Write a structure and sequence with these properties.
The PDB classes it as viral protein. The structure is a homodimer of 304-residue chains. Chain A is α+β, with helices and mostly antiparallel strands and 304 residues long. Chain A has 3 domains: 112 residues, Thrombin, subunit H (Beta Barrel), CATH 2.40.10; 85 residues, Trypsin-like serine proteases (Thrombin, subunit H), CATH 2.40.10; 104 residues, main proteinase (3clpro) structure, domain 3 (Orthogonal Bundle), CATH 1.10.1840. Chain A is built from 8 helices and 13 strands. In chain A, strands 5-4-1-2-3-7-6 form a 7-stranded antiparallel β-sheet, with no helix packed on it. In chain A, a hairpin with a 2-residue loop joins strand 4 and strand 5. Chains A and B meet through helix 1, strand 9, strand 10 and helix 8 of A and helix 1, strand 9, strand 10 and helix 8 of B. Bound molecules: the ligand Cc1ccncc1NC(=O)Cc1cccc(O[C@@H]2CC(=O)N2)c1 (2 copies).
């Protein structure tokens, strides 16, 4: 028992972190096979970031201008190319520590672990969620660009995020490993504001199931609701509308606890309308939305 | 910017996790050099756990009865000994992945990362704190025993915890790597209740400094207090008494923000007396006490 914001073990990803330097800028790169992936803004100066023409900036750059270092050893760069907002540096050595991997573009509401790195060295690991407004609420400082987000299935690492920028609001934006930004963000030091950050309803419900499984049951009530009635409440509180697909994914948790999905929705509804009244749920004084129904099942069953 | 409950990268510790089986019981072991450390209750049956005589139970056990497996390969056990509540299984092969390491017994209020394992395989990593009542609020299921807690300084892993048991209250108890339990707990399936869980005041203050550094300043007020006055409030709210040693450790955070420690104490005092009034601090609706002043400096400076 107990329930924690748990990240995947990061070892398979630590073995892929390298340092990429271009001119005066140093950031993190991801070394998989003979390719090093990193944010394309590694080629920019602080002046360039105001209105960068990446195709023009890359013309003035040769293979020898990209310094790639894995630990204390230098990798020889034999090719370079831009794919959307990432640079792919072909090195002459395949990474011997490359795990089984995939590049996956995640959906909003899905969770992932981040291995924050500086100068190609890992500093920490934490669990994140892709917000419905396509930002992530991470912990990143200058030098953290190129840090990756990922999920692990047995021995396969699914890379889903690469950190590129911090918005003036302190929230984070980045790309998938094909260099496509999540959301409308661009790699330019220009005014970019995030949209409305809605709450991931299906994740809050999954966390309510985790709370019941772990002993915190005070919020269970004698009521039920319908999807349409629940969604009227969800709209008023900037919660994502709950669909039958969401109800379906909550099925294993509903079966385990014996609490119908719509009954748990009625508990959520009263929690939204009345608040916690000074109480906590799984040591939290607010409704947690960064555990998917998969994370709850995984944590409560011990999938390694 | 941003502030997250961040754990250390777990790779150096993943390379040490093995599976230890004795009779019908399987738990996790820590393989460092030619020694595998694991909880001594691996030798017990469910009936034995009621009143186990570990010295007598160990008499009926030989080197060949301890099955140690690292991944898919079996380790040959050439020695076994009991040190307090841990067994030390001498194997004939030094772990090639052994990092630089120390065994350290941590103080209450100090934080550490846990790598939860099942069958010698890592499932997740999370950040914990040794509670003032010597329990930890972790996430552990049956099979997780032998999972370790640790800190990393550059390339040195300081092992500080080994998971042994879950109390009927859902909180966790365990030992340092010399087999000495933190707190009064014993490895026996008997009635054991934890003492009063007090709040780690110096950590709450350090987290208030992290909030100021990250933009959340609403809680800053026009007041100050004294150590004695603050401690009268801290006592009423089951908070650890703040000492001059605590004020001293908060010095770098006080210097960085320009907010005197006693001024931050007055903010904490009003927060304790009036609550959050529906507001949040670093995305939390309660006062967080699982970040030491060292964790705040580390996270806000990017120590890798
Ligand atoms: C310093 C830091 C800290 C944490 N995480 C990342 C960074 N770095 C950056 O943000 C550099 C950068 C890269 C692309 C675009 C860009 O402009 C953004 C877009 C907007 O509003 N400001 C800036
Ligand atoms: C099942 C599980 C889940 C999570 N973490 C650990 C476990 N395992 C245990 O707890 C086994 C065990 C080992 C020592 C003592 C012991 O009795 C405790 C003492 C008390 O009150 N109950 C039990």
């Amino acid at each position: 028992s107990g329930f924690r914001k748990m990240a995947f073990p990061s070892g398979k990803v630590e073995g892929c972190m390298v340092q990429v330097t271009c001119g005066t800028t140093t950031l993190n790169g991801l070394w998989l096979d003979d390719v090093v992936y990193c944010p394309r803004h590694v080629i920019c100066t602080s002046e360039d970031m105001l209105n960068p023409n990446y195709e023009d900036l890359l013309i003035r750059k040769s293979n020898h201008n990209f310094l790639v270092q894995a630990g204390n050893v230098q990798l020889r760069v034999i090719g370079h190319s831009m794919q959307n907002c990432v640079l792919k540096l072909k090195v002459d050595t395949a990474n011997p520590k490359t795990p089984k991997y995939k590049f996956v573009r995640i959906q909003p509401g899905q969770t992932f672990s981040v291995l924050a790195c500086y100068n190609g060295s890992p500093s920490g690991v934490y669990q994140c969620a892709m917000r419905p407004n396509f930002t992530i609420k991470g912990s990143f400082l200058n030098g953290s660009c190129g840090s990756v987000g990922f999920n692990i299935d047995y021995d396969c690492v699914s890379f889903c995020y690469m950190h590129h920028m911090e918005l003036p609001t302190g929230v984070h934006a980045g790309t998938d490993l094909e260099g496509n930004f999540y959301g409308p963000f661009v790699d330019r030091q220009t005014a970019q504001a995030a949209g409305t950050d809605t709450t991931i309803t299906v994740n809050v419900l999954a966390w309510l199931y985790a709370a019941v499984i772990n002993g915190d049951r005070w919020f269970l009530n004698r009521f039920t609701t319908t999807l349409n009635d629940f969604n009227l409440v969800a709209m008023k509180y900037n919660y994502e509308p709950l669909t039958q697909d969401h109800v379906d994914i909550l099925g294993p948790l509903s079966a385990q606890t014996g609490i119908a999905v719509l009954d748990m929705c009625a508990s959520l509804k009263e929690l939204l309308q009345n608040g916690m009244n000074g109480r906590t749920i799984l040591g939290s004084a607010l409704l947690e939305d960064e555990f998917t129904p998969f994370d709850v099942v995984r944590q409560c069953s011990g999938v390694t």
